[PDB]
Ligand binder design. Sequence first.
Ligand SMILES: *C1(O)O[C@H](CS)[C@@H](CS)O1
Ligand SMILES: *C1(O)O[C@H](CS)[C@@H](CS)O1
Ligand SMILES: [Cl-]
Ligand SMILES: [Cl-]
Ligand SMILES: [Cl-]
Ligand SMILES: [Cl-]
Ligand SMILES: [Cl-]
Ligand SMILES: [Cl-]
Ligand SMILES: [Cl-]
Ligand SMILES: [Cl-]
Ligand SMILES: [Cl-]
Ligand SMILES: [Cl-]
Ligand SMILES: [Cl-]
Ligand SMILES: [Cl-]
Lengths: 574, 574
Amino acid sequence: VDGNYSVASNVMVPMRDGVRLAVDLYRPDADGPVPVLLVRNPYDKFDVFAWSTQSTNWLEFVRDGYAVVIQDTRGLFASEGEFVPHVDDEADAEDTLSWILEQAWCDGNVGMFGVSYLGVTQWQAAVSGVGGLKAIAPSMASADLYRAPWYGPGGALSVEALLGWSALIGTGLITSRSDARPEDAADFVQLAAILNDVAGAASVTPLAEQPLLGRLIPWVIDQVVDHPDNDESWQSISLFERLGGLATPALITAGWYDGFVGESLRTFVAVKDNADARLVVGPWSHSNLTGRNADRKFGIAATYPIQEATTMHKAFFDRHLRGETDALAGVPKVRLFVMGIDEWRDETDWPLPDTAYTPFYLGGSGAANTSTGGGTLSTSISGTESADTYLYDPADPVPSLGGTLLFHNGDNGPADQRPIHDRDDVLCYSTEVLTDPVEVTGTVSARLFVSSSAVDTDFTAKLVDVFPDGRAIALCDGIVRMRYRETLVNPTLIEAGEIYEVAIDMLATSNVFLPGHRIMVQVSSSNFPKYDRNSNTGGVIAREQLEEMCTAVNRIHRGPEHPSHIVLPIIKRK
Amino acid sequence: VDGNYSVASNVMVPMRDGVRLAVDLYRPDADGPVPVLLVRNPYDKFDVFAWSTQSTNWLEFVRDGYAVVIQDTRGLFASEGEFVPHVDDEADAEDTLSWILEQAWCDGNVGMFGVSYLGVTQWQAAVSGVGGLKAIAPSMASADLYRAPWYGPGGALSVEALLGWSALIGTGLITSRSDARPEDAADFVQLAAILNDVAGAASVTPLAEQPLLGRLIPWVIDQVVDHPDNDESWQSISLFERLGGLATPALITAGWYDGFVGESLRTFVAVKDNADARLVVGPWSHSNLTGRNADRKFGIAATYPIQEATTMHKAFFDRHLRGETDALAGVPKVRLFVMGIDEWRDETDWPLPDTAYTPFYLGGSGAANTSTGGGTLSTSISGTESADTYLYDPADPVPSLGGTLLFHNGDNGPADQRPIHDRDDVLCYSTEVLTDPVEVTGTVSARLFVSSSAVDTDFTAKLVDVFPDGRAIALCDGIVRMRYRETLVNPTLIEAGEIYEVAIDMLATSNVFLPGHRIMVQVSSSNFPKYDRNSNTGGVIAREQLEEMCTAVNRIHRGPEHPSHIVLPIIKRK
Ligand SMILES: *C1(O)O[C@H](CS)[C@@H](CS)O1
Ligand SMILES: *C1(O)O[C@H](CS)[C@@H](CS)O1
Ligand SMILES: [Cl-]
Ligand SMILES: [Cl-]
Ligand SMILES: [Cl-]
Ligand SMILES: [Cl-]
Ligand SMILES: [Cl-]
Ligand SMILES: [Cl-]
Ligand SMILES: [Cl-]
Ligand SMILES: [Cl-]
Ligand SMILES: [Cl-]
Ligand SMILES: [Cl-]
Ligand SMILES: [Cl-]
Ligand SMILES: [Cl-]
């Protein structure tokens, strides 16, 4: 009967080492084999409502004749083995895909879909060389775990992401084990305390001493905190350099305030030339898909459009798993939620063709410290040679407000920045009030001429849309940890007092700055706990006590010989 | 096989009039008949992810051997017939329950669960007299549709709820019909415009002229706007007076910032003496179950505890549908999220035994207008005879901020009230800063001595927790429309200048006002668009143009002879 299906729970699938992973099979009433979709989940395959609202109404797929397999990853819930993030997922995906392809009910065409870890695992599957995998759909994901979510392109630890997620998994690991232990109740309370106060958890020094999390999930220290360089341990689990050799269609979803946005977009660029890639980007953060935020509403159209996503995914899988050649007729290659105008818009590529990568130079009379300083932004190079100076004290970092926070206040991406505008270590540069709209849609970066009293420090840059009523709404931001200014792999220290030209990768955005608005940039040396705080010593940061850390006098140089600027991806549409 | 199940889609169930409703059947692998749970849904039975995250992980029930039936209500999606809210649901539930009880796979025990309209429909089923219905679990629901969600105990129209919901249903009605009409695209755009600006939609006068909504869903005017009195049309669909005669166990869930909270709690009180009733109340609004709000976080424990809810529901159904006499061992009768301390706490009854209903009298030197006026609250009667006076202008009502908003900014219940504290028509009365905690948990009401220059007007009261940092966080509120001061059924006008003692039903709350806080009350004559604005004419409010409305000089009298007060349900726990 068309539209009917069955569900078989805890089918045990043997991996190459004999360890069995548990899957649930959602199989249509059909007269032969069918195309199959696989989801690999570390958050309990039974708990479909927890993630599915951030993905698709995928029971539609089953009603329409796809089978869906949802698997508990190794060592969690109904699966056997031991859980360690990332390290087993390439092999376990390969073995699971192979098993699916052998089954009586599989017609030789397999795809995947899902969000976050259920997205990362798709890239890990895609590099398997299993020919039967015909398409993937990774949402809010990455193919380079160093670059997102654990560190970043600037070489700072994403400490709130790490501690928050590890606490969440710790809840899952305890729930997963054989029998209830006497210490479980107390552990549950302590994990809740982390999740209620992630900045507090991230503030304890040395950062690497994590009695609870290090016991429940040793990986948090053994892999993540202990490997600050993008070294061989990270390379082993990175998929990114293999993506260029694939020819697998990928339906990639991202969010402008999502921790993964830079890496999600990079995956699109990596695969678009060799296969049918699609891109959808909304104004979401990882835990807030609503389009509504404390000081910024994007409209109901911005709410994660789950039924349209379901329709698009089905069309995509119909094309690539069922060979229906016209199934993607009328579906755009790229679909972006353009903020400011707050509208969805179709595009033919990402980056947009006809992006003008335009320098906006830092300038102004007098000090740019605070929002009431003299800092300006202009497409003209600054005429006078100036410098703005501030003290960065690791004991008092600039607090994270919105942006791409994951677990610490991760539900307010477009946050009003006014609460930090009176800080002397927040340098502000803005355009005059705009008389005509300026669209910035693309990857964003800064090139700053900087110096420090320290042998290492950080520099941050954050793009902001200043509204007529004074709201200073965050758009995108990044950081550079100076030891990693030239390479994430082979860091070197800097010379105190020397001027360096450094790049800051500020991920990406899509925003029309409307008439009456200003374009604004904040520059500082911290953004905590989005990123851990540089100790300004040149030491092993995660092993330092707060008292061992140093203050730094940091300086931004601007003028004709030191033309510090932000590069904005300008789109002009007449 | 234990834990396995099948799903049959669009099984057509004939009602007494021959109209067939569509259901989906989730049936366990079992060797005989099983207990059955029914959900009646006007938002597409296929779309399980849309509502289920506000309810239960109910596939657990199916894995554990319950069948679940999800039905499209009459006239929507796969069902035949014509949709009109509420009026067919008693009969259609009775006929559906009868059909279920006849099936080979039903063991004679049926229950229900679900939220909002999926909760209201359970009360409509419970009055059917079908013996096979053994238990219900209505969450965020009402048994009196006048009192919630469409009007209220004060006799004001809940206009934002009506217009928002009607626009949402209008999206569903268009999606449900036979073929795509030329006007659908434009209608979709107009419905989105309402949902993006519900206060704007509610501001158009006469309110009763609704070209779009009145066309798509005539009921919005024909029933709701046209029947402002709690008359026979409302009585026909009310279940409340029948609840006392039932002996059906009910697991009732509510939220302190939920539009239905007063009516949800009343249902518990109505059924607790004759059957096993249970109550769970969290700090949620109808669309925000997260525990996180713009200026108030309740902690991760406050997040809707879906797996604990699932466990509790299964225990409840095991007791009442499977006759497992000890299934509810250790489950409390009442479980409340107590705000302020921000902790869950078990109780033996609602209202709490040992509630001290305590008057806090309005007082103060000079005018109480604005938060910087002299208004005080005290357990002692005020010594001097005073009055506070303000102008209520319907063209400039007090804006709704938090509370029990449903569709207009309905995701910030505990909203900071400071943005309206400089208004001359917002009278503020507060205690001194507290040195010891004061717990207020229970139903809340005010008794005000009032007068007006008009023959009708409204009075509002709102309880507020003032935090040390100045946040003035809304707790609960109500309104009295003066023509309905003595009865919602047979209104009469007032005499200009005469003093009336009136009651304002402020629903309920649970809050510990901690040391360093104040208890605060705001009094006014509007709260828009939570409630429509009184025209101050004595006319048919929804038929008046704004220009036809009048301003009113309204007065609150306070002193020994006019002891205006709020009655707080004080709990003292040593
Ligand atoms: C997703 O499920 O949430 C996490 C946020 S850090 C991420 C870990 S790879 O996957
Ligand atoms: C629930 O589904 O949401 C509505 C809020 S007004 C309500 C109508 S009875 O049911
Ligand atoms: Cl293992
Ligand atoms: Cl262990
Ligand atoms: Cl906005
Ligand atoms: Cl749009
Ligand atoms: Cl100098
Ligand atoms: Cl130089
Ligand atoms: Cl009908
Ligand atoms: Cl019609
Ligand atoms: Cl708070
Ligand atoms: Cl608690
Ligand atoms: Cl007078
Ligand atoms: Cl009198």
